[PDB]
Design a binder for this molecule. Structure first.
Ligand SMILES: O=C(O)CNC(=O)C(=O)O
Ligand SMILES: [Mg+2]
Ligand code: NI
Ligand SMILES: [Zn+2]
Length: 331
């Protein structure tokens, strides 16, 4: 068995190997990459996502989210308070202000220490979940707006034709902006490209151990757990690496830098934070190996998780027993 310790693997495809996205994903899995839940892909030196970022300040962040924490430094939830719209140029200036800017630090490890010590005492503003793309239309390799759709994968594997679309999302971050512990909708893959700016630190639990993280989360967030049998779908809970280590939960960590891709694999729980002003692009995708994960994915029916249009068909076809309850949650 490849990668039996579930380490995060880093790949360096050549320009030839970067042509065929599906083939490369299947290669990485042949080497055991999925066992970690997360992999890094460094593009060949010949590749670029677009020519420059000199012209992005006019993108609108219609609903910036202030991420307000409750709890203790290592175990907390965050809620998203909606803020007035602002442009990317306005948001970058805010990120760089004395109130929000990255503190002085020695290296990524020192910054990580400072994040876990101090996150809860601040409320950073995240421009998350913005439909759109920064890849040039002429970029033909690993262009996250030109991937094969999940609907087409389901159709190719299962023969069923369904409604829905699959488009990318932009994320504008600042110091301490946080993504809570989650797997993807329907335990899909994700791919995330860091277009510019400061790094993103990731934490990940191997898919084979995801239920260990779920059991700890039920213990740590007991009221939330009574409220919903899949409350990590709410994407509000944080648990630090120190707390994970104290409770014996297997995990790994890695820092993504500008110009790098990360792939999350089906049922790979992940969480993390931004180091400073940055911009990422991410999308969900599927492969044949996902189908079985999609069939078994948990679902929130309490009403909190509220998701896209396109998840309806996935539930309806892969999980027809759950469909009626899940749809009540959506309505
Ligand atoms: O970048 C972020 O804030 C969150 N991204 C992801 O969870 C992802 O790409 O799967
Ligand atoms: Mg612009
Ligand atoms: Ni994710
Ligand atoms: Zn729920």
């Amino acid at each position: 068995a490849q990668n039996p310790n579930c380490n995060i693997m880093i790949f360096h495809p050549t320009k030839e190997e970067f042509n065929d996205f599906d083939k490369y994903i299947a290669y990485m899995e042949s080497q055991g990459a999925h066992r970690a839940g997360l992999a890094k892909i460094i593009p060949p030196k010949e590749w670029k996502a677009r020519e420059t970022y000199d012209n992005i300040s006019e993108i609108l962040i219609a609903t910036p989210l202030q991420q307000v924490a409750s709890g203790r430094a290592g175990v907390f939830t965050q809620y998203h308070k909606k803020k007035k719209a602002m442009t990317v140029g306005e948001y970058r200036h805010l990120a760089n202000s004395k109130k929000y800017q990255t503190p002085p630090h020695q290296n990524f490890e020192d910054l990580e220490r400072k994040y876990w010590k101090n996150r809860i005492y601040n409320s950073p503003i995240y421009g998350a979940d913005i439909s759109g793309s920064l890849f040039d239309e002429n970029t033909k390799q690993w262009n996250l707006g030109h991937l094969g759709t999940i609907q087409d994968l389901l159709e190719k594997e299962c023969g069923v034709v369904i409604e829905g679309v699959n488009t990318p999302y932009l994320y504008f971050g600042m110091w301490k902006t946080t993504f809570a512990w989650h797997t993807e909708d329907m335990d899909l893959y994700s791919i995330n490209y860091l277009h510019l700016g400061e790094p993103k630190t990731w934490y990940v639990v191997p898919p084979e151990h995801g239920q260990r993280l779920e059991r700890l989360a039920r213990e740590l967030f007991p009221g939330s757990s009574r409220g919903c049998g899949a409350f990590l779908r709410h994407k509000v809970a944080l648990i630090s690496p120190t707390v994970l280590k104290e409770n014996g939960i297997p995990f790994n960590r890695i820092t993504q830098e500008a110009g790098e891709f990360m792939v999350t694999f089906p049922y790979g729980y992940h969480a993390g934070f931004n180091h400073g002003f940055n911009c990422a692009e991410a999308i969900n995708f599927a492969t044949p190996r996902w189908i079985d994960y999609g069939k078994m994915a948990s679902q929130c029916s309490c009403g909190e998780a509220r998701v896209t249009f396109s998840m309806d068909a996935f539930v309806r076809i892969l999980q027809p027993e759950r469909y009626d309850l899940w749809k009540r949650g959506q309505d």
